[PDB]
Design goal:
With about 30 residues, chain A is largely without helices or strands. Chain A contains no helices and no strands. In chain B, the strands form four sheets. In chain B, strands 6-10-11-18-17-16-15-14 form an eight-stranded mixed sheet, with helices on both faces. In chain B, strands 1-2-3-5-4 form a five-stranded mixed beta barrel. A three-stranded antiparallel sheet of chain B has the order 7-9-8, with no helix packed on it. Classes of the chains: A little secondary structure (about 30), B alpha+beta (about 500). One diphosphomethylphosphonic acid adenosyl ester (APC) binds next to β17 and α14 of chain C. Chain A: It is found in: Cytoplasm, Cytosol; Nucleus.
Chain lengths: ~30, ~500, ~500
């Protein structure tokens, strides 16, 4: 195929750094 | 009851609520849990259940208000594509006085907050039994009682909020649209593409054939054009050494409005170094089939082009996609040989295609150029055969000012278009990196622009210079997001997948 | 040699390659491996080692052509912000005649593909030793032997070829946007697109671009903010929306201003600006930590040889209240907050602006005076991320009145390095109050405030169908990009910035 290039970021996704908890949960629309 | 009367009366009522310090527009209501999670948590409850040891705050919009006593009032709370019953009993409310007061306040359409216990009616309808109901935002207008939903497109498209309240499927269309866009980003990100932003205002528009929007910059005393495609910028980036780029963004066309046409639309473009259009066909197959399967659960989808009052097509996105070569297949459809492909720039050719269009009753409004006549013929004879995803390949150079010449077939280019349901969703080619050829082609384009054609494009010299610094062998690709959205939400009309579509006023 | 002659000579030479059919612009070269993966795989090689069982195709641009002579040449091949040595010696090539032909063909700047073997030199340099070298795309110009800012911003491709750090800035920009999307997506937000051309421009204070729609005989305005559409969608029942998109201003092109720029706007139902303060702390702090590795960031607002500021994004962020801290910084008491719509107050603020030498161009409205005073006394204290809160309603026509302090609104702006990066507030959902404020704005636009707002009657109607308690938020991505790439120019974070030809 085409040569591998590593993803600039990941390997997503972040907010594994930070998710606030002051507001009720809605689920990720993509899941 | 008359909606204007209703509005006058209700506005008065709310005003009264304001002057009494009864606070009809509170600042903060603390929601404990989504309606969705509430349902998922307490659905297991038996008819007659009433959790005394669990108290929760939910919010939403009242869809209905009905009585079963003077001490019993049921509200239909809606939110998140979902419903919960509010069983308001006098015995469970904080006061008889306040129960009476709040039930006198509330009308259908109001945004409320509810603090109450989970329960389920004797009938078996999951409900919340309120200690207190709070008016969060009143609806001043009368929401229509409709048998067949809001059907009036004027209302639906101008007041999208009404459409979203009164029709449940709208929400899901825009969810699907988001899923598409996000899926694409994830696909490309994982292949090492860098997401970029290029200018939406330029001094000369390029990248496609279209009539542009013109605006004026005051401080600089010059006209800027709204962009038709980010193409040339991306190719410059690849010259600068960024090997894989993409941008999902808005494009502008000063045309008219039809079922597949809005003045502003969303496209994705990517450019990939050391790729050719065969690589792009393979990636496209993977991306489109993957997308469809991931979003809908299957490779097969159904489409109603003429609406639900019409035929259903079964569309199979199972790879690999059918491939056809434009010229050969056009010949095969016409049942006639067309001129040699190295002879497409000639007047003999133009005359032949003109005659064929006349004889096959295919209209081509002026200018009846070879390229246009070709396009109309392809639209008539090939594009209609493209129900399942079909690549139409190897376009003539006269239709493709920025595509690299074909390495076997003279007069053709290494280009393809993806068709689904008779409409184009992708356009891609091995990119032209020879500065000289590119300049010649720009010159023929500018010559055609001199005769009066406002869609045929300008000469970007900066781009030609950039090509002179060395654009690597590269393949590029564009996709019409809105169209993909249409075909995945079974919408026969682009106004369906734009939140606020352009409307000719009333 | 002379560049305009180099170009003619090269043009001729490449043309000759064309007419001879040696194919200077080949259609397809198959790269087997990235330069980065090549290096990662074969950096571990001992010097003088030479893997012969491995043959690989790589590609890139030529930054230098140096010959030991005469059977040997070294090529400095760059791509991806890395470099690889091509050690071309005659005995390893496919043929000595082809070796000579191909070396006589190549120049610096050329895109080439290399097929060959991995191996280090005795000197220690990781290299590829070519069986064959193919010309992929000739560079017809003299490449510079690049600091001049105008020349970089006008020929961004040269900048990216020659300067390594630019690519890194744009990667950081992309990481910022991607982070934001991950953050909101995971919080249950729907990513949406609202119109970029309107009939009435709304949402912010700005001077619009006007353009004409031919087939409707109607003028349309390019947008300054997506705000009113988002609020309409929350009315529609979509509780959490966001949009990272372009915005337009017919204004001055400068060090920190571009006519088009990128914002992120999000709206959240059943939230207030306190909630939004927590969310902002978490998002920005986490963003910075994720991108840079630390909460700590050094910034140079004027030059790399100028004052360096050390910024701590560790939450919680400092909070100041606008009127209170202005009273502290002015050494005096300001009018009671419920008096701010009086010309008494306007006159007092005008006198205070004069007395402390603060320039307010006309029209000297209460809001513009107030803004100038905040700019002077308050914003300059905001090095570390600082929330400036509780703006007066005269500055905030779409913000909901404060629930204690009459005359104030439930609003904050986030400041880093004396510059605003966020603007957020508890949304005004009262259709009557909103109509009134629009009317006041329209009065101030008839008496010549040029950026002052118009009257969206449709927006007002939407509000009448009922907007739930909601809090909204906006961020200037371009500024965050400047601050995380140590750029004091906005041109540094826009690939193709607007130039004044
Ligand atoms: N107003 C618009 N709305 C939606 N998409 C548009 C658009 N204008 C252009 N596009 C996109 O850009 C592409 C341009 O298609 P073209 O072949 O140049 C003219 P067309 O009218 O779309 O085809 P046709 O005239 O043969 O039916 C389309 O595939 C479409 O996805
Ligand atoms: N021309 C421009 N370039 C970059 N950002 C801009 C901009 N115009 C407005 N903004 C954004 O909008 C916010 C401030 O807007 P303004 O109301 O115009 C205050 P200003 O700084 O005096 O200009 C900032 O967060 C900034 O990111
Ligand atoms: N800019 C093109 C799409 C990219 C084609 C491949 N370079 C268009 O508007 O159709
Ligand atoms: N539209 C605002 C941001 C949104 C503020 C919250 N409604 C601005 O231009 O700054
Ligand atoms: Mg087409
Ligand atoms: Mg400001």
């Amino acid at each position: 195929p085409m040569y591998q290039v590593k993803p600039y970021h990941g390997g997503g996704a972040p907010l594994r750094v930070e998710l606030p908890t002051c507001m009720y949960r809605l689920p990720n629309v993509h899941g | 009851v008359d909606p204007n009367q209703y509005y006058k009366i209700r506005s008065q009522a709310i005003h009264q609520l304001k002057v009494n310090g009864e606070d009809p527009y509170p600042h903060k209501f603390h929601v404990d849990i989504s309606l969705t999670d509430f349902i998922q948590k307490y659905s297991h409850l038996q008819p007659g259940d009433h959790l005394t040891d669990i108290t929760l705050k939910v919010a939403g919009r009242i869809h209905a208000k009905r009585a079963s006593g003077g001490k019993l009032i049921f509200y239909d709370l809606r939110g998140e594509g979902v419903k919960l019953q509010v069983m308001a009993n006098s015995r469970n409310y904080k006061s008889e006085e306040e129960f009476i007061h709040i039930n006198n306040k509330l009308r259908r359409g109001d945004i409320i907050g509810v603090q109450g216990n989970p329960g389920k009616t004797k009938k078996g309808e999951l409900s919340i039994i309120p200690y207190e109901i709070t008016l969060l935002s009143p609806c001043l207008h009368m929401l229509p009682h409709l048998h067949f939903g809001l059907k009036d497109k004027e209302t639906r498209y101008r007041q999208r909020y009404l459409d979203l309240i009164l029709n449940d499927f709208v929400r899901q269309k825009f969810i699907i649209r988001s899923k598409i866009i996000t899926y694409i980003r994830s696909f490309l990100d994982e292949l090492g593409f860098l997401e970029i932003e290029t200018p939406m205002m330029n001094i000369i528009p390029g990248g496609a054939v279209a009539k542009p929007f013109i605006t004026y910059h005051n401080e600089l005393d010059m006209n800027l054009y709204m962009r038709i495609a980010p193409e040339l910028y991306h190719k410059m980036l690849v010259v600068g050494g960024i090997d894989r780029v993409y941008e999902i963004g808005r494009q502008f066309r000063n045309e008219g409005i039809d079922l597949t046409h809005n003045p502003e639309f969303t496209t994705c473009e990517f450019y990939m170094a050391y790729a050719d259009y065969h690589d792009l066909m393979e990636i496209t197959e993977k991306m489109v089939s993957g997308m469809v399967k991931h979003i809908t659960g299957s490779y097969k989808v159904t489409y109603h082009p003429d609406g639900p009052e019409g035929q259903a097509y079964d569309v199979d996105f199972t790879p690999p996609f059918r491939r056809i070569n434009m010229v050969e297949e056009l010949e095969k459809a016409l049942g006639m040989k067309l001129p040699e492909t190295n002879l497409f720039e000639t007047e003999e050719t133009r005359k032949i295609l003109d005659d064929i269009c006349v004889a096959k009753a295919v209209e081509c409004p002026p200018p009846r150029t070879t390229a246009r006549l070709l396009d109309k013929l392809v639209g008539e004879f090939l594009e209609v055969t493209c129900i399942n995803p079909t690549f139409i390949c190897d376009h003539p150079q006269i239709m493709s000012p920025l595509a690299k010449w074909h390495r076997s077939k003279e007069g053709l280019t290494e280009r393809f278009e993806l068709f689904v349901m008779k409409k184009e969703i992708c356009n891609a080619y091995t990119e032209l990196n020879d500065p000289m050829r590119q300049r010649q082609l720009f010159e023929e384009q500018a010559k055609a622009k001199a005769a009066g054609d406002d869609e045929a494009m300008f000469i970007d010299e900066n781009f030609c210079t950039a090509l002179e610094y060395g654009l690597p062998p590269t393949a590029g690709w564009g996709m019409g997001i809105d169209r993909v959205a249409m075909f995945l939400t079974d919408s026969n009309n682009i106004k369906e997948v734009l939140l606020f579509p352009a409307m000719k006023p009333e």
